[PDB]
Each structure stands twice: as C-alpha cells, then as structure tokens.
Amino acid sequence: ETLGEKWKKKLNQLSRKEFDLYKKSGITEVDRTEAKEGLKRGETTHHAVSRGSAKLQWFVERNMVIPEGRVIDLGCGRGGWSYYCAGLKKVTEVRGYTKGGPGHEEPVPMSTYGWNIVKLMSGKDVFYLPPEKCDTLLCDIGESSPSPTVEESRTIRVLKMVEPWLKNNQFCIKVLNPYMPTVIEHLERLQRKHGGMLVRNPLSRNSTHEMYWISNGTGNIVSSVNMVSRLLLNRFTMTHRRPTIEKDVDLGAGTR
Ligand SMILES: Nc1cc(Cl)ccc1NC(=O)Nc1cccc(S(=O)(=O)Oc2ccc(C(=O)O)cc2)c1
Ligand SMILES: C[S@@+](CC[C@H](N)C(=O)[O-])C[C@H]1O[C@@H](n2cnc3c(N)ncnc32)[C@H](O)[C@@H]1O
Numbered sequence: 001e002t003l004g005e006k007w008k009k010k011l012n013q014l015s016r017k018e019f020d021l022y023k024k025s026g027i028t029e030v031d032r033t034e035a036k037e038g039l040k041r042g043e044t045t046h047h048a049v050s051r052g053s054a055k056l057q058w059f060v061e062r063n064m065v066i067p068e069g070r071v072i073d074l075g076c077g078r079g080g081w082s083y084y085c086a087g088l089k090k091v092t093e094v095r096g097y098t099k100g101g102p103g104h105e106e107p108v109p110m111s112t113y114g115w116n117i118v119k120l121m122s123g124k125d126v127f128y129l130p131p132e133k134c135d136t137l138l139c140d141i142g143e144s145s146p147s148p149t150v151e152e153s154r155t156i157r158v159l160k161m162v163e164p165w166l167k168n169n170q171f172c173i174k175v176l177n178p179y180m181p182t183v184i185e186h187l188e189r190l191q192r193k194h195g196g197m198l199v200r201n202p203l204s205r206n207s208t209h210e211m212y213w214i215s216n217g218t219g220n221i222v223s224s225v226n227m228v229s230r231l232l233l234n235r236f237t238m239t240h241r242r243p244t245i246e247k248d249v250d251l252g253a254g255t256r
Contacts, residue, residue: 002179002180002181002229003179003226003229004180004228004229005148005179006233007209008146010233011207012146021240022206022235022240023205024240024242025206025238025240025241025243026235026241026243027204027205027243027244028202029243029244029245030051030054030245030246030248030249031245031246031248032248034047034248035047035048035248044109044111044112045110045252045253046250046251046252046253047112047251048080048249048251049079049080049108050077050078051203052078052080052081052140053081053083053248053249053251054080054203055081055204056080056084057084058201058202059212059214060088063216064199064212064214064217065136065138065171065172065216066090066136066170066216067088067091067138067170068090068091068092068135068136068170069090069091069092069134070092070095070133071093071094071095071134071135072095072096072097072132072134072136072137072138073096073139074097074139074141075097075098075099075126075140076096076097076098076120076140077140078105078107078108079096079107079108079118079120081096081140082096082118082120083112083114083115083118084249085136086118087112087113087114087252087256088114091114091117091136092117093117094117094118095119095121095132095134096118096120096121097124097126097129098120098121098124099124100123101122101123106122107120107122110251111254112251112253113251113256114256115255116256117256127157127161131165132165133167134165134169135169136169137162137165137169137172137173138171138172139171139172139174141158141174142155142175142176142210144208148177148179148180149180151177152177152180154176154177155175155180158174158175158176159173159186159187159190170215171196171214171215172212172213172215173213175187175198175210175211176209176210177209177210178198178210178211178225178228184222188221190213191213194215195215196213196216196218197213197217197218197219197221198213198214198224199211199212200224200227200231202244209228209229211224211225211228
C-alpha cells in the first residue's frame with residue numbers, strides 16, 4: 001500500500017465540514033472576486049475564464065513548459081490555458097478541444113490579448129481524436145473519483161492517448177493519480193522516452209493528488225510523488241492554515 005492510497009483512504013473518511021477545511025489548508029490560490037464579477041456582467045477583456053490561466057502561468061513563469069508554435073490544448077474546458085498561451089510571444093496558434101455537453105464545461109468566447117489565434121472546439125472527445133501536428137501539447141484531463149482504481153484507469157488512458165501527440169515537443173500533462181504503482185511504471189517508461197519531470201503545482205487543492213508531467217525538467221518521479229503524499233498526509237494533522245491569496249492574472253485585450 002502506497003502513502004498515496006493511505007491519503008486517499010483518509011480523504012474518503014472526512015465529513016463534508018472537515019473536507020471543506022482540509023481542501024484549501026496551506027495552499028496558494030488567486031482571488032477570483034473581480035473576474036467572477038466581470039464575467040457575470042459579460043466582460044470579454046482582461047479576465048481569465050477560470051483559475052486555470054493562473055495554474056498554467058505558474059509552470060510557464062518557471063520555464064517548466066515554454067509554449068511555442070502551434071499549441072494544442074486537450075480538455076480546454078472554458079479555455080483558461082488557451083487564452084493564457086494566446087498572449088505568449090512564441091505562440092503562433094492555439095487549438096483547444098473539449099468534450100462539452102452535460103457534466104462538462106463549454107468554451108467561453110473572449111477578447112483577451114491574442115484571442116485571434118485561438119479556436120476552441122466543443123463536442124470533441126479527445127479519446128476518439130487522431131493526433132495532430134503541433135509544437136506544444138497541453139492536457140488538463142482527469143476526473144477525480146473516491147476509487148483510486150477508477151482514477152488509475154483514467155490516468156493510464158490519458159498517458160497512452162497523449163503519447164502520439166508528443167513528437168519532440170513542449171508539454172504539460174495533468175496526471176490525476178500519480179501514486180498508483182502501475183501509473184508509476186507508465187510514467188517512468190514515458191520519462192525514459194520523452195524526458196521531463198512530474199511537478200506539484202502549489203495552486204492545486206489538497207483534495208487532489210494531481211501532478212503535472214512537464215517537458216523541461218529532470219528528477220526521480222517516485223521520490224517527487226512520495227514527497228506530495230507526505231505533504232498531503234501532514235495537512236490532515238493540524239488546524240486549517242488559510243491559503244496564500246494572490247492577485248489573479250490580467251490577460252489584457254486586443255489582437256496579436
Ligand atoms: N454543457 C451543458 C449542456 C447541457 Cl444540455 C446541460 C448542462 C451543461 N453544462 C454542465 O453540465 N456544466 C458543468 C460544468 C462543470 C461541472 C458540472 S457537474 O459536475 O455536473 O455539476 C456541478 C459540480 C459542482 C458544482 C459546484 O457548485 O461546486 C455545481 C455543479 C457541470
Ligand atoms: C480541469 S478542466 C480544464 C480547465 C482548463 N485548463 C482551464 O484552464 O479552464 C478539464 C476539462 O477536460 C474536459 N474533458 C474531460 N474528459 C474529456 C474528454 N474525453 N475529451 C475532451 N475533454 C474532456 C472536461 O470537460 C473539463 O472541462
């Protein structure tokens with residue numbers, strides 16, 4: 001039994017009150033007040049459509065993934081990653097695909113900086129899509145489940161799906177459940193072939209063990225995974241720590 005599975009058993013035993021006080025204990029988060037207010041009024045400039053823009057921003061500002069040329073965004077949802085990449089000088093095109101329909105977010109049309117190079121397509125299940133030529137591959141897919149064996153199936157399927165889209169290019173791929181032993185085996189094989197490293201984003205809630213496989217970095221995957229399991233287990237041991245609250249991202253306005 002991995003440390004991650006122990007964390008999961010404990011997470012599953014929490015009452016709703018304890019879960020709500022655990023999920024943001026000691027994390028970092030952006031203040032969405034202004035953007036939620038503006039988005040409700042129908043404003044299409046400056047605002048990120050979701051928390052996702054700031055989440056990808058954290059990786060890019062640390063050079064973990066460096067978007068360039070044709071950017072593919074798998075599971076773009078509302079489009080937070082796509083609108084963030086559209087404003088980057090090395091980016092020439094952004095194509096986002098997302099499922100849509102019941103239970104799934106729809107792309108939000110915006111006019112933030114670089115909107116003219118973005119095309120978000122809904123009604124697109126990525127597990128039925130042929131790979132496309134691209135220079136940057138982004139994937140934020142992985143639905144949480146109380147069952148780590150369900151999450152393990154979901155993680156492996158994403159990892160197997162993205163591989164054909166990785167053609168010596170930049171990448172940032174969400175790994176829903178990186179602690180399950182068969183997931184570790186797949187990641188290690190993928191790291192040998194494609195390089196990169198698994199990283200824990202500070203903006204991720206304690207209610208998920210998600211890590212991101214990024215193209216620019218190196219390291220021991222098992223060791224970084226167990227470090228997160230230990231951190232997440234330690235956050236059950238003390239009274240809620242209020243999160244670090246940061247300014248949300250300003251994505252500007254206008255064409256590129
Ligand atoms: N596209 C669409 C087309 C049609 Cl015909 C009908 C509905 C939609 N739209 C969605 O079903 N949106 C949607 C987007 C994200 C999640 C979910 S959800 O998981 O189903 O339900 C939640 C989850 C959490 C919360 C909350 O407040 O925390 C609220 C609702 C739905
Ligand atoms: C975490 S959200 C993406 C958040 C986004 N990166 C942002 O910044 O706004 C993951 C998205 O993947 C979508 N998704 C899940 N399964 C999918 C599939 N099979 N094909 C395409 N999109 C899928 C979900 O509907 C959801 O919107």
